[PDB]
């Protein structure tokens, strides 16, 4: 009669012996080699109509069980003396807002995180195989849930949405008529810390292009390129990108200390789901793990994947060259035909090119995910770095090659303004359609169909739970916060790479992000399943990617300074000093940008003092056991 | 009747109450608030001749005391299963080469380190002042030895040389007739880990300019600038500096794991000796510490020190301009006088300029050390960073301004070759005279005088100890490994900044370092006192300084490519494409250099596995106390 927290969906053709063996490994206590979780079927009775939903099981636990699981995970809660310490069951009375009759201490995100973590740490010791299935090779030290997922018995494990606390989050989230700081702490308590860091980063990055847009809106309209001759605005833009990328690191440390995930120790990562080698003794841990020879992994990268990426980049350049012949053909068609179709025909080939870019990027994303899931990467952190490298290089190249080809080969700034504005707005509109609005529309149709099916059932089913579980079974799963950072990287690419010749593009990012804060929120609320809460202390490798964009943008902006007609009027006869002065401005901005990233400290002032006290308190505890 | 390890030299005018109070705080046990160290006077009897040496005291301890002190410091020794773990007294039987009757377990360097560490951790609890001295303000939590040093009662605390194990180190150290790998492990066991890391770094850096010298010796003699036109050699030199600065980091982690100081935790640093503020509650530790308002420290830097450094840099440029008028005057005097004094007069003004540089650098070093000891820096790590910044900027500027002024203003490569070779060799010769050879000569005279005084004494003094302690009392103290890294930085500066126009200078570094390995060894053996052993895991901020030299050298070498007569023959008419191609080579080398520093991992492969096992073993221990 408990509250369901995690849903396990078994497959159809599952024998009874495996069901009872799994049920006996869940309910049995922690000292008997079980997991001590409360288990329940979805329905106590069944009729011939609902027999195809007879495999859904709910997993929860009791309060003392969640506290013992909180000791095992290492949740970081606030103490009564305003200090973030690791949670232990023996010292549980010290923490703020805690009673022994308080079910509101551990939030639903941490409770769902602990139950997924206890199913992950469910290992086999005596059993060499799963009873009833030959191919389930079980060695001692292998997770049970991982082998059930890879062998196709457990289809999906997903946490449950809370339909009455989600609406109270949505009431204070969708900003639409008034500027308002987004409630990142309530987002955190509902969605974990990784999803909250992205929404904190999106809310931060929106309030960092407002100086670019406010300065750059009259800088393009009133043409102030006569007075400063492009030196103040280019210098202001590039120094400003470094300042927001350093103040984001300060703000991210401050936020992630307020939640506690700055102090969680690095948990040792198990091999990822889909890493197969030969069974052997792991050298590091001393346990039994799959082993793979390192030379086969290095060969599969640097001889198959890297040539395939190079072929795809060459193929991306080939599609770019096709587009420019289409542009010349359309310009000739504009010279041929008339007066009426003289402005609408000029916007058509960039739109066709924009749609082809956003189709080829998703096609390249599936091929690169497959080609990196084929290389048998061991950890999950390593797999993410290689996938990020392949997809980032191609998306950088495929989106900005055409703008680079216009600016530095044709050298035609009127065509560059038109093409940059059209590419940015069309890619964003097509992004907002394929990311959130069209999947939300398909979900409304699918939700209405399941609801109209459930109200016509003629059974005594408690509908308030079964309808909810059936709806969240067929939702789409969240594939990490990787695409949601990639959209911001390409927006930051379109704004900052060519902010000299077209600063107005900065405004076209801000008017997008005022929707994106809404649109992504809808994508997490009514589109996808609830993602499992995952602790993260920073955005990760994306800090290096955004900073690399701000260094590349120095070279690109300085190359656009040395081609404008304003600066070439300064040195009409001596074109050998213009390049030297532009290179001096380029090296001075690069040196000043790296000094700014090196001068500003990474952690803030008072957070560094609180982290220093927590280290000194832990060092004295070791000293006290010695003393 | 023990073995003396540490000598404490008191002042002359020290009252008897302070002597007995200090002696009662040393001999008393660790539980009674003392230090439990064996204490002894230098001489049991005294005559009227040796009354001025009546304040020297010897401090040692017993074997169980050193093991308990080794638990407090955290020495990292090897276990029997080839694993580096922290030393504890309860698990003392696990470690290699250990008996209960083995005095060769803790080496003399670690024993002298523990005794200095126990005198440092000798705090006052009840006493508000030193008995007999008014000005010794004692608060609870203040070190006793630090206040005795600053108030001028304890003159110096220095460890003792072992005159029979030092000779057995010198027998295998001075290489002179045959190339030989320097014995860094025996250097480590005698001199601590910081001094051993410098000698390991000098031995490494010598075997890294041998490819520069071997390639650059026929590259200058046979003039191969015709065939490659300066592209291969400049690219080879700059990529090679990054490779040795990354393989040094790999080699330093490997060496410092073999000694154990990669795993010693960061000890919390006490305020440095000479930091005075107002007495208050330290916010971090919660103890009582001096506090200083942060705005006064920031004002004393950015309004007094930084203008003084700027005045000294302007004054350094003024001395440089005086030298060039002297060069033109000497060139005119060469045009005036004759044929005979036509080559010796050309080498005189650079030698006069070289002597003035090495005098002004030491004068600037005293002024900058004083000006940074005046800013009241709190920790010692922070004080070292500011002193390194002032001295490095001026030594970089004062040594290479003249070479920059010749290369990029006069643009005269014949004068540049002559001036660079003369500056490098004369600064090194004057460095080797003032660093080690002349202080060794003064020490031989001083040692003979004390020995001839001691053999004519007419007393029953045990001369084998008293002669040794009197000699090491008046030696010079080692002022950190800061000057010894600065010499290598300027050598690396003279080689790599202008390796294009003069690669022969690389050979002039190697023929210096083959002496420097000898010369510095003599400086540590027969010149200075024995330094106290100090643990260090890396060279510190010098990795950033050497890498910054290798990035600056890309820009300087590319600017020397774009001025030679070989490359200007490629583009005779179009001087606007030469700058673009040189800038493209400059940006391609900078991008490839940072990718090389980012691609090669910092820790080696197997050391990373051993450090990962040590983390997993410690994490399981926390898990076992929970389980
Ligand atoms: Ca979007
Ligand atoms: Ca998004
Ligand atoms: Ca920073
Ligand atoms: Ca020297
Ligand atoms: Ca030296
Ligand atoms: Ca590296």
Curated annotation (Swiss-Prot), chains A, B:
Membrane topology: Multi-pass membrane protein
Tissue-wise expression: Highly expressed in the brain. Intermediate levels in the retina and heart and low levels in the placenta, liver, lung, duodenum, kidney, testis and spleen. In brain areas, highest expression in the frontal and occipital cortices and in the cerebellum. Lower expression in the fetal brain than in the adult brain.
Alphabetized UniProt keyword annotations: Cell membrane, Disease variant, Membrane, Neurodegeneration, Transmembrane, Transmembrane helix
Residues annotated as transmembrane: 195-215, 228-248, 304-324, 340-360, 388-408, 488-508, 541-561, 578-598
Gene Ontology molecular functions: calcium-activated cation channel activity; chloride channel activity; intracellularly calcium-gated chloride channel activity
Extracellular side: 216-227, 325-339, 409-487, 562-577
Localization of this protein: Cell membrane
Name of a matching Pfam family: Anoctamin
Cytoplasmic side, ranges: 1-194, 249-303, 361-387, 509-540
A GO cellular component annotation in the UniProt record: plasma membrane
InterPro entries: Anoctamin, Anoctamin_TM
Family, as annotated: Belongs to the anoctamin family.
Clinical disorder: Spinocerebellar ataxia, autosomal recessive, 10: A form of spinocerebellar ataxia, a clinically and genetically heterogeneous group of cerebellar disorders. Patients show progressive incoordination of gait and often poor coordination of hands, speech and eye movements, due to degeneration of the cerebellum with variable involvement of the brainstem and spinal cord. SCAR10 is characterized by onset in the teenage or young adult years of gait and limb ataxia, dysarthria, and nystagmus associated with marked cerebellar atrophy on brain imaging.
PANTHER family to which the protein is assigned, alphabetical: ANOCTAMIN, ANOCTAMIN-10
Miscellaneous notes: The term 'anoctamin' was coined because these channels are anion selective and have eight (OCT) transmembrane segments. There is some dissatisfaction in the field with the Ano nomenclature because it is not certain that all the members of this family are anion channels or have the 8-transmembrane topology.
Name of the protein in question: Anoctamin-10
Organism expressing this protein natively: Homo sapiens
